[PDB]
Ligand binder design. Structure first.
Ligand SMILES: Cc1cc(=O)oc2cc(O[C@@H]3O[C@H](C(=O)O)[C@@H](O[C@H]4O[C@H](COS(=O)(=O)O)[C@@H](O)[C@H](O)[C@H]4NS(=O)(=O)O)[C@H](O)[C@H]3O)ccc12
Ligand SMILES: *[C@@H]1O[C@H](CO)[C@@H](O)[C@H](O)[C@H]1NC(C)=O
Lengths: 383, 74
């Protein structure tokens, strides 16, 4: 079904320029199904492409293969983790030989545990574990073909991700303790997303919960399938218009700091809470400030009371709600009742907070998600 | 009733995420689109991408292991 396919120097330059000019760090997957006779990896094609990028002054990190677990299904070849481990050492040698010897290497981009991936990853990390700067794995909650609206709003679906992550950390801790763990490709639903679901406000429960849980459980980097493309899980549509997950992804970057803390509800399935230090790059916010974010999957509004000593602090609300009439199936979203649109092709809107009456409880409508910045929190940890 | 009390842990960072914590992919599938050049050229799309800096852009997917570099190809 899947056939080999060539790509030009122009393809590479296009892709490099897009990243460089957008301020993003390109990671390039190399063809790991190029095999020598002895079923080892053939590096010559990859060798051509290292040579070209090095000649051009291209700062790029590298991967080798995507979901080796199913090379047997995809191309009638089984590659064991040990060999894929050896194949990664071969490639790491070439990067050390090459002009960017400090070049970072990520792998092996295996699917989630439920796809019978544990052995392959453990064998891979025992063998190749030393040369890779992060372990990459993939997660999708659902099949795009069968995913329902109810699936997207189901806390029992969101919770299976917790076990996926615990299982990955179990393999890694038994092989390369303290190695960084990255979600290398992840979204709502495989097969290119759930039509009229993966591209809506409804996709945001799964995206924001994945982000909260990944941060809480020790995932360092989450790579969203996809920024742009054919799949319904794209952040940007085919007309280059941002979908609700774009605005969510932007508001997360503005408000959420790198320092992960914890929140919990005293009652804990349909009210999902996450706490980090505020991103202080926002001139509005200073060190010690907290960013709370919350998902409400109840069908009624909930009123969150801040714990002592934060009950009386000034809180900025960033509440995200669909623009009607399609409700959770809408491709448009309002921040605090104002529709989020590009001001023009050059210009993102401001993201206006809504300051709350100090000492008021935090209102979170049914089927919504919100950020709350607790100003003058003065959390020493947030320094 | 619909009033919920939160508990916070604020003693120390439990984890440190990369500044590029929220990163993004382009699927390898997209390098097999005729319109590829046009799409990544979009200055609108670049406005949108810049708003996500800092982040990794991962180029990969099923086609990763079905793409062959041609230094002779256009
Ligand atoms: C069986 C299964 C379970 C699972 O949890 O994850 C999977 C991920 C899979 O594949 C992985 O997840 C994605 C997905 O599928 O959505 C694929 O996406 C591309 O390829 C898909 C074809 O899948 S494939 O069978 O031909 O590989 C297209 O439907 C999709 O639109 C396209 N992304 S796009 O941006 O270009 O639109 C990825 O390339 C691939 O790494 C494949 C199977 C599974
Ligand atoms: C919420 O869900 C329950 C299902 O048990 C339903 O019977 C109830 O009337 C719903 N409430 C609202 C406000 O829609």
């Amino acid at each position: 079904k899947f056939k080999n396919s060539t790509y030009s120097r122009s393809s590479v330059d296009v892709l490099y320029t897009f990243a460089n000019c957008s301020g993003l760090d390109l990671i390039f997957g190399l063809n790991a199904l190029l095999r020598t006779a002895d079923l080892q990896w053939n590096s010559s094609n990859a060798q051509l492409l290292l040579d070209y990028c090095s000649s051009k002054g291209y700062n790029i990190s590298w991967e080798l293969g995507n979901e080796p677990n199913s090379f047997l299904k995809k191309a009638d070849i089984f590659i064991n983790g040990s060999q894929l481990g050896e194949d990664f050492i071969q490639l790491h040698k070439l990067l050390r030989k090459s002009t960017f010897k400090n070049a970072k290497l990520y792998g092996p981009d295996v699917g989630q545990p439920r796809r019978k991936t544990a052995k392959m990853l453990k064998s891979f990390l025992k063998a190749g574990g030393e040369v890779i700067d992060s372990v990459t794995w993939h997660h999708y909650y659902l099949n795009g073909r069968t995913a329902t609206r109810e699936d997207f709003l189901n806390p029992d679906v969101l919770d299976i991700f917790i076990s996926s992550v615990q299982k990955v950390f179990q393999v890694v801790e038994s092989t390369r303790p303290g190695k960084k763990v990255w979600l290398g490709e992840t979204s709502s639903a495989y097969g290119g997303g759930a039509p009229l679901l993966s591209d809506t406000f409804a996709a945001g429960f799964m995206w924001l919960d994945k982000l909260g849980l990944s941060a809480r459980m020790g995932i360092e980097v989450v790579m969203r399938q996809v920024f742009f493309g054919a799949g319904n899980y794209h952040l940007v549509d085919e007309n280059f218009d941002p979908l609700p997950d774009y605005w969510l992804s932007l508001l997360f970057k503005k408000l959420v700091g790198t320092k992960v803390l914890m929140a919990s509800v005293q009652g804990r399935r349909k009210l999902r809470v996450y706490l980090h230090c505020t991103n202080t790059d926002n001139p509005r916010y200073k060190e010690g400030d907290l960013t709370l974010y919350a998902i409400n999957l109840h069908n009624v509004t909930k009123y969150l009371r801040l714990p002592y000593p934060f009950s009386n602090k000034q809180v900025d609300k960033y509440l995200l709600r669909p623009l009607g009439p399609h409700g959770l199936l809408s491709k448009s979203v309002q921040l605090n009742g104002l529709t989020l649109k590009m001001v023009d092709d050059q210009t993102l809107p401001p993201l206006m907070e809504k300051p709350l009456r100090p000492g008021s409880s935090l209102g979170l409508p049914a089927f919504s998600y919100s950020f709350f910045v607790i100003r003058n929190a003065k959390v020493a940890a947030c320094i | 009733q619909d009033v919920v009390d939160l508990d916070f842990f604020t003693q120390e960072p439990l984890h440190l995420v990369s500044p590029s914590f929220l990163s993004v992919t382009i699927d390898a599938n997209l390098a097999t689109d005729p319109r590829f050049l046009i799409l990544l050229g979009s200055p609108k799309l670049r406005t949108l991408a810049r708003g996500l800096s800092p982040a990794y852009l991962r180029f990969g997917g099923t086609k990763t292991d079905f793409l062959i570099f041609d230094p002779k190809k256009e």
